[PDB]
Design a protein around this ligand. Structure first.
Ligand code: LBM
Length: 141
């Protein structure tokens, strides 16, 4: 599977669903559909967390990378599982929405890059060794 495509299709779905434009996301698919529905379910179960995160990020172009790294380290500090990976995608979405809300749309390209590099380097071994995206689809698809 393709981590860049998974990130691109997720961020495009989340932003387009809420009326936000991301030019670079303008457009195997059972993975995208499964992640979409898992993420939407996560968002519904933890709306209060979705709301507190959006209201406190306080992004600027120079602090965006540090805010992303700080949250993602805390998310995986106790270990990785599929639910924390889904939460990682939803947090990336929140970062992208808040970037546009604060007139920093170019930051969406950076956030998508950071998310991809994170799957490619930090989370890669865990995802592969726990069955890859195919296991994720079999468990939650
Ligand atoms: C600084 C911070 C670190 C502070 C903390 C927080 C917020 N926290 C993050 C961690 N969190 C977690 C973590 C793990 C799990 C879990 O059970 N893990 S699990 O057992 O592996 C699994 C279990 C079920 C499914 N799927 C169900 C299917 C049912 C049928 O429909 C399809 C889906 C999956 N799965 O992967 O799909 C995997 C979980 O519970 C659930 C429950 N329901 C879920 N539905 C989808 C995912 C999911 C997880 C919730 C709780 C909220 C921060 C925060 C804030 C805002 C944003 Cl925006 C983000 C983060 C920041």
């Amino acid at each position: 599977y393709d981590n860049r495509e998974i990130v691109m299709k997720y961020i495009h779905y989340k932003l387009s669903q809420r009326g936000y434009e991301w030019d670079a996301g303008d457009d195997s698919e059972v993975v995208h559909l499964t992640l979409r529905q898992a993420a939407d379910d996560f968002s519904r179960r933890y709306r209060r967390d979705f709301a507190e995160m959006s209201s406190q990020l306080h992004l600027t172009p120079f602090t965006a990378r540090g805010r992303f790294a700080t949250v993602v380290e805390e998310l995986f500090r106790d270990g990785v599982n599929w639910g924390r990976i889904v939460a990682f995608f939803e947090f990336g979405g929140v970062m992208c929405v808040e970037s546009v809300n604060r007139e920093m749309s170019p930051l969406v390209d950076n956030i998508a890059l950071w998310m991809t590099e994170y799957l490619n380097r930090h989370l890669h071994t865990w995802i592969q060794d726990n069955g890859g995206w195919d296991a994720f689809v079999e468990l939650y698809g």
